[PDB]
Write a protein that binds this ligand. Structure first.
Ligand code: CL
Ligand code: CL
Ligand code: NI
Ligand code: NI
Ligand code: NI
Ligand code: NI
Ligand code: NI
Length: 359
């Protein structure tokens, strides 16, 4: 009766959402008792009437940060980094005084003291980046305010892989993607895979994410609905793989490092205690809140991953909108990929309706 029940709630929830939000193409995965169930609607390419399939690639936007968090967790477990390490330890030319006291933890969790949402578009090279961070003036002491920022976790990702001697992309492929068998997940989509790469749509124009500094670390992953379902499965408790630093790093990305309001900051992932007030995550997902500064309280030592949690992340690019959420206690989760950037609360409310019916 379970597959019939899943089909019904997914159909009755997503069909009106697509119509209300005018979404051109969408893929949904429900992870129910650890098993994935896939659903597709609409078009990856409107002009060519190419349907969304289980092999369609979507831009994950900020959901990419969950991969960066896990790769950072793997580096901790390898002994290559410590979150209490100063950021300057891995970038010694970053000598400016305001960086004294700023750690990898602060970069990973948006708590360095006001690093901006986007790296400025005029910053392109590594030397541009150095000048940007050397000249940046924090608004707050480190570890006091959370301000969501690609320039923060993006730099965390770039520094965390330095001890490996690998590029960020090589580290992600070899240490996260390949061990988890995510073989249709890319930082740079290869030419033969472009036939499955959906267009994003913004004001009715077909767009892909623009290149930018630290894009790979902060918002550059593209993936299929099947690989993202396998990503959810990999972040659920029963994961037991040969690559034990990765198994441990996944658990560390769900550690609770900071609290603000009723939410907890992990590495990439964000968490709330479950059962959760649905209005809190729906309302809190609005960018008028999610992009605003909020005071944080440190959790020392970080809370080890709590099984009774709602774990989630929204993401967007100019042309795409994504959402992933799961409940480790229930072995239950959802992935929603769309080639239009429609408002976060609509994504979260739909996910709440589906998972509440199945939990
Ligand atoms: Cl650590
Ligand atoms: Cl929003
Ligand atoms: Ni293939
Ligand atoms: Ni139940
Ligand atoms: Ni139940
Ligand atoms: Ni039950
Ligand atoms: Ni029950």
């Amino acid at each position: 009766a379970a597959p019939q029940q899943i089909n019904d709630i997914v159909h009755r929830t997503i069909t009106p959402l697509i119509e209300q939000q005018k979404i051109p193409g969408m893929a949904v995965a429900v992870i129910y008792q650890g098993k994935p169930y896939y659903f597709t609607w609409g078009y990856a390419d409107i002009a060519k009437k190419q349907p969304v399939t289980q092999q369609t690639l979507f831009e994950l936007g900020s959901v990419s940060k969950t991969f960066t968090g896990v790769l950072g967790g793997d580096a901790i477990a390898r002994g290559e980094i410590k979150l209490s390490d100063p950021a300057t330890k891995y970038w010694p030319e970053l000598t400016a005084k305001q960086w004294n006291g700023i750690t990898l933890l602060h970069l990973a969790t948006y708590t360095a003291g006001g690093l901006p949402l986007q790296v400025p578009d005029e910053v392109k090279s590594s030397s541009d980046l150095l000048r940007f961070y050397q000249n940046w003036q924090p608004a707050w002491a480190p570890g006091t305010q959370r301000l969501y920022a690609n320039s923060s976790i993006g730099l965390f990702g770039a520094l965390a892989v330095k001890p490996s001697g690998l590029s960020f992309e090589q580290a992600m492929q070899t240490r996260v993607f390949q061990p988890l068998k995510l073989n249709h997940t890319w930082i740079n989509v290869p030419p033969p895979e472009e036939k499955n790469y959906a267009w994003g749509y913004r004001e009715g124009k077909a767009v892909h994410v623009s290149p930018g500094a630290l894009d790979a670390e902060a918002y550059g992953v593209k993936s299929t609905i099947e690989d993202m379902a396998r990503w959810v499965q990999s972040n659920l408790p029963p994961l037991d793989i040969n690559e034990k630093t990765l198994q441990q790093g996944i658990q560390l990305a769900q550690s609770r490092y900071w609290q603000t309001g009723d939410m907890y900051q992990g590495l990439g992932w964000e968490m709330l205690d479950w059962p959760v007030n649905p209005d809190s995550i729906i309302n809190g997902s609005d960018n008028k809140i999610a992009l605003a500064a909020r005071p944080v309280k440190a959790i020392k030592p970080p809370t080890p991953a709590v099984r009774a949690s709602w774990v989630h992340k929204t993401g967007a690019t100019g042309g795409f909108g994504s959402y992933v959420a799961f409940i480790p206690e229930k072995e239950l989760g959802i992935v929603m990929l769309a080639n239009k950037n429609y408002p976060n609360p609509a994504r979260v409310a739909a996910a709440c309706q589906i998972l509440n019916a199945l939990q």
